[PDB]
């Protein structure tokens, strides 16, 4: 549904930032 | 060569499972927040708008004529039907105060039932809030313990040997609190918004009781 | 009603006693 | 040094006794969960069936005719018998408000008694969940104290010489957390489920009071003509 | 780091995770003081008014005397609002003879209004209770991050000199300090407004009770005079 | 110098000594209350359970009096039946059965609450010992820490091994704090639950008295009207 | 130089303000204890004397004739007057259930008002019991920040230079607990005293309602 | 209930232990 997809996307976005900033 | 991702990469398999578990608990607490926040906003907005319309009514007939268009899942229409249904179950009764008692009791059950049903999902917020500190802490205690168990074999005298493992351990408390704080804020927010919603629904149910009570007494005087 | 919902960080006291030992013993 | 048995065997009695106590608290919280969950699930599953059948009923006599096929341990059949028995004991009365208030009071008491009986294990769970962290803290404060005595006696140390002592303290903490986490989860699962059950039983009791009260009024009306 | 330092220099070298923590706590404390100044002025005005209205109604011996005395009160007056709520229950019951019906309905209406006014008077209190309960643990998270960064320093530099552990203890102190500076006012102000709500709901309940006593007695005297 | 728990207590500062003695005495009180209250609650629970089970056959308030007349003077169920029968004998002239029912209901609810209050005696010590004994210990820790840093300063010493005895005092003052606190908090929660269960059981007995009285008044009234 | 007094004399102005603030909070919690313990002693001793006298009353007229001994500050005389005054305001009523509901409602309001007035100081005591550890430990954190800044302002390599600053800091927590512990003890003593007193006063008010209600029913029955 | 304080506060123990940890983190690098 829309609430689980929104939540997992915003946490996907912050962990993608940890992947980027750790190079 | 440490960073918040590199620490997760070079951790024990038990600390990884704690960190993944806490991140999934974070995904759940925010999914519950976005789901319930929209539901409470829509139901609050509808109920307040219905109450503003029903405030015009001066008989239970006029009230259920005003409500007749409300959606089939409207709470004020559901309460008005539940009062009208006690009348249609009671048509042989000359006793009016018995109807006033039975409707008062039955609407109290339903206002409580709506508030209870609206509280679905809060058991996860309370549990995630209570245990996430202890689950993160278990990750830290285990991570520290596995590091010193190692030095106890190597006999090395330098703190810089354990320091990576110690930092990897403290990070599981940090993630533990990041899972905990939102859940405990959000649990209190919804516990308070359910209290305010149940109170507003009680103010709507009270209008149904007052209209029914007024009409039964006016009808009794008109028959006399 | 009756659920436990409060934060309880008390095992971090135990962790801080352990860091207090490892800093005490790792003096230069 | 090498293993959890190494910490357990080479641990101060105070810390060893704390670890046995926390392990027994872990055993009792799982014993309560497996013992209570199966009988609670059968009560919850049964009561939901009884309510779905009784929701059809439109007089107290019809509700007795629905309920008579229920097992002799059914809480719904108990509430119907408890209400029917107030009519049995009141047969010479011409006052109905007395029958209503006595029945209302007697069912309220019966529902509360089942509420106490259903919640019976919770005192252990709430206590073990709140207190096991502090019992763990006493175990670590004591193990850490003994490690400062070790420093004070030997007066020549490094982080490997104390490593057994802090590994024993951390193990006592880990056992404390392993007792605490299940106890809070299990306690919250039951606190939700018991609340839902007391509410469902209260709505069955409410239907019995509504049926009796309505039936007395319709009989008292018919008696006027 | 360790040369000509100041508390602001200690914030200037902090990690970006601990800056966000303490900036977030500073904003949460600014909202705490904004609520304190806003609500304390409202409680003073409302309680100072309601005390006057109660003292002006104390000589009333009928609902007609209460209604005329209260006609001088401003349209925002809670005491006039409760008297209009009781008067309206008579003017919506005019053809009835069941005075017990009028009394129970008026009792229920005024109880709902007293609850609603108390519920509205408490508007900001849930924010204050949240900051007082949570800000210690938000501060604690920043301390754990500072302590962690101190071990990152030891690991990255392969030494235990004060200069390499210092950045971590520095930001751990700030996270503790700002955590306490947010917590302490929020606990104090929440206890003050919980006491002020208890005192105010009780005083409003005494006014609502006077309205019920006046109405109940006046109906029973009118019924006896009809008999 | 001895570093046994006794030698450590013998080396400690007077402020830390009287903290340790104060906490030890608080633990002696916490167990003295526990054994005193538990033997009384067990006897009062066992007695009231038997009395309730033995009153269950009563068809009428007169049968309940004849059953309860054999109960000893301290019997709570006999005391509740006396409160109900006394409201009848105080109001023989009254013809308002509803009043008697209301006055009796009010008296018995008040009596059950008074037995709850009387049974809750001494719990204030358990709450207070549970709340303060952690802090009292904490204070003993911090005073031990201060004395050790004052000792470092006065002696101008720089080997951290000289403070290891001093922080062992502080850790012991912590430990004795938890040893006083944890039993007191557990026992307070236990007695709070046992009193709630006892008030409920006594309430179920008091309810049977009201049901018997109310039914006898209604049945007497219909017989007199006929 | 260094002593439990001497380390106050040269401490930072912020921790001097924290220590003085906690010493003032200590003085206030002891002033509240000596003020309220005398008030509870006299108020409970009088109420016990008055209840033990009223316990023999069989009618409300007999209770008024007993209570005329009591001084104008008497809570029992104030409860008898509230009940008697409802008869005097209501003399035209033949409805007695109205006199019962009005009297019952007025006495529970008076008992609540007296109970709420007895609780005057407790909000302060619970506040000082809650915050004093944190206020004292904020004094330590600022003292440790100054000590740590002192190393960066004058670079140094032995702990005996900073050890006075550690003692100067830690004293603020010691004074923090010395303020907290009395406040929690005194608060619990008064919470328990108030509970027992509100119940004793409620048991006197209950006797007044029983006397009035029984007298109305007997007076009404005398019409037979 | 009657409003008694009857439970361990948890948070004053964390925060004082936090400063006990920090004072030894600054002191131990300055010992021999
Ligand atoms: C340094 C600390 C050392 C450890 C101190 C541990 C605590 C010591 C105090 C223990 C008191 C035990 C009292 C037992 C009362 C039993 C009452 C009863 O008959 O059983 C009840 C069920 O039992 C209880 O409620 C007991 C509650 C748990 C107490 C035991 C766990 C304490 C914490 C862990 C201890 C183990 C670790 C310590 C090892 C040294 C039945 O129901 P109820 O209505 O009477 O009570 C409410 C629940 N329906
Ligand atoms: C690791 C710790 C830090 C990160 C994780 C925690 C971050 C905080 C989580 C906050 C979640 C809030 C969700 C939104 C709820 C809003 C609901 C609402 O409408 O208002 C609430 C009131 O507002 C709240 O409860 C807000 C609480 C905010 C807590 C913030 C703590 C500081 C966090 C700092 C870290 C983040 C820094 C970000 C960069 C600056 C409830 O109503 P009321 O009756 O109680 O109050 C009405 C009057 N306002």
Residue numbers in the entry:
A (entry chain F): 10 to 32
B (entry chain C), G (entry chain A): 9 to 232
C (entry chain Z): 12 to 39
D (entry chain D): 9 to 233
E (entry chain B): 6 to 232
F (entry chain E): 8 to 233
H (entry chain Y): 11 to 42
Show the paper's wording.
To stabilize TonB-ExbBD, DDM was replaced with amphipol PMAL-C12 after the first IMAC affinity step, and the remaining purification was performed in the absence of detergent. The stoichiometry of the complex is one TonB subunit, five ExbB and two ExbD. The TonB TM is a 35 Å long α-helix, tilted about 15° from the perpendicular axis of the membrane, and interacts with the ExbBC α−1 helix and α−2 TM. In this region, the highly conserved TonB residues Ser16 and His20 interact with the ExbB highly conserved Trp38 and Ser34. The cryo-EM map also shows elongated densities in the membrane region at the interface between adjacent ExbB subunits. These densities were attributed to lipids that copurified with the TonB-ExbBD complex. For the remainder of this report, the designation TonB-ExbBD will refer to the consensus 2.8 Å resolution structure with TonB bound to ExbB chain C.
The Ton and Tol systems are sophisticated molecular machineries essential for virulence and survival of Gram-negative bacteria. Both systems rely on the proton gradient at the inner membrane to produce force and movement that are transmitted to target proteins associated with the outer membrane. Ton is involved in the uptake of essential nutrients such as siderophore-iron, vitamin B12 and carbohydrates, while Tol maintains outer membrane integrity and plays an active role in cell division. We have solved the high-resolution structures of the E. coli TonB-ExbB-ExbD and TolA-TolQ-TolR complexes, revealing the inner membrane embedded engine parts of the Ton and Tol systems, and showing how TonB and TolA interact with the ExbBD and TolQR subcomplexes.
